C-alpha cells in the first residue's frame, strides 16, 4: 500500500463534502482514511448574491486538525513539503 | 450471518431467488433497465454484471434529467460503472 505511504508528510489539500478545502501537512492516515493535518487552513467558496463579483474566499487558520475519512472526499498535492533547509 | 462458515452460498441463493434476481435475469436476457439515482437523473441502459452491493456494470446507457421553464437534457455513455448506495429505484422493461 505504498500509494499512501509515499505521500506521507506532503502538503495536501483535502476536499470536504460541503465544498470546503482544508490545506495542511498530511502527517499520517489509517484504514478509515482519518487524516492529520498540521498548520491547516480552511477555504470555502461563497456564491455572490449581490452582483457578478469574484468568488469570495474566507480563510481560516486551524493548526493541527484531524479529518474524518467519511467526511473526506479527495486530496491533492498543493505543493512539496516545507523544506527545512535554508 | 446465519451461516458463519466460509463455504456459505447465501449470496448465491439470494441472487438466484431473492429480490436481486431482477438483475440476474436482466443480464441473462440482456434486457434494458431504467434506474432512478440520487442525482435526480434517470439512467436507461443494459446490465452485464453485479454483486450484493447493487453495483452494476452498464453499457449503451443514456443519462436523462431536467433542470428548472423545465428543460430536459440527455446524453449517452457507452460504458460506465454505477454505485449502489446512490440508487433509488430500478425498473425493468415492462414488456
Amino acid at each position: 500500500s505504498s500509494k499512501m505511504l509515499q505521500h506521507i508528510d506532503y502538503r495536501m489539500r483535502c476536499i470536504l463534502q460541503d465544498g470546503r478545502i482544508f490545506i495542511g501537512t498530511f502527517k499520517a492516515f489509517d484504514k478509515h482514511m482519518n487524516l492529520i493535518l498540521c498548520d491547516c487552513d480552511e477555504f470555502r467558496k461563497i456564491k455572490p448574491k449581490n452582483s457578478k463579483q469574484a468568488e469570495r474566499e474566507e480563510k481560516r487558520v486551524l493548526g493541527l486538525v484531524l479529518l474524518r475519512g467519511e467526511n473526506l472526499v479527495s486530496m491533492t498535492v498543493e505543493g512539496p513539503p516545507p523544506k527545512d533547509t535554508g | 450471518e446465519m451461516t458463519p462458515e466460509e463455504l456459505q452460498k447465501r449470496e448465491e441463493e439470494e441472487f438466484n431467488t431473492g429480490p436481486l434476481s431482477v438483475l440476474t435475469q436482466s443480464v441473462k436476457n440482456n434486457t434494458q433497465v431504467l434506474i432512478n439515482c440520487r442525482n435526480n437523473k434517470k439512467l436507461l441502459g443494459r446490465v452485464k454484471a453485479f454483486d450484493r452491493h447493487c453495483n452494476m456494470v452498464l453499457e449503451n446507457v443514456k443519462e436523462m434529467w431536467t433542470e428548472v421553464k423545465p428543460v430536459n437534457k440527455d446524453r449517452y455513455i457507452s460504458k460506465m460503472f454505477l454505485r449502489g448506495d446512490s440508487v433509488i429505484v430500478v425498473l425493468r422493461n415492462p414488456l
Partner: protein, 81 residues
C-alpha cells in the same frame, strides 16, 4: 466480488462523477477494497467551478457517484473473476 475488477483497471483513463456533481477525468493508478482510487495526471471540475489539472488525487469511495469507462473494455473477459 467486483472491486477486484475495479482494481484491475489500472493504467486506463476514465471519467468519474461524484455525489456533489464534481467531474474528474484521469488515469487510474491504484484502488483499495474501500473503493478509494488514486488518479494521476487528472483534471478535476467542481460544480460551478473551473477545471484544474492535478498531478495526483486520492479519492474516497463513499463520495463517488459513478464512473465512465472506455468503450473498448473487454467486459466478458474481465468479469470471469
Amino acid at each position: 466480488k467486483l472491486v477486484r475488477f475495479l482494481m484491475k483497471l489500472s493504467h486506463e483513463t476514465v471519467t468519474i462523477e461524484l455525489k456533489n456533481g464534481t467531474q474528474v477525468h484521469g488515469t487510474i493508478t491504484g484502488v483499495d477494497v474501500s473503493m478509494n482510487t488514486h488518479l494521476k495526471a487528472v483534471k478535476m471540475t467542481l460544480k460551478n467551478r473551473e477545471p484544474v489539472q492535478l498531478e495526483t488525487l486520492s479519492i474516497r469511495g463513499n463520495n463517488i457517484r459513478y464512473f465512465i469507462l472506455p468503450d473498448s473494455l473487454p467486459l466478458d473477459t474481465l468479469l470471469v473473476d
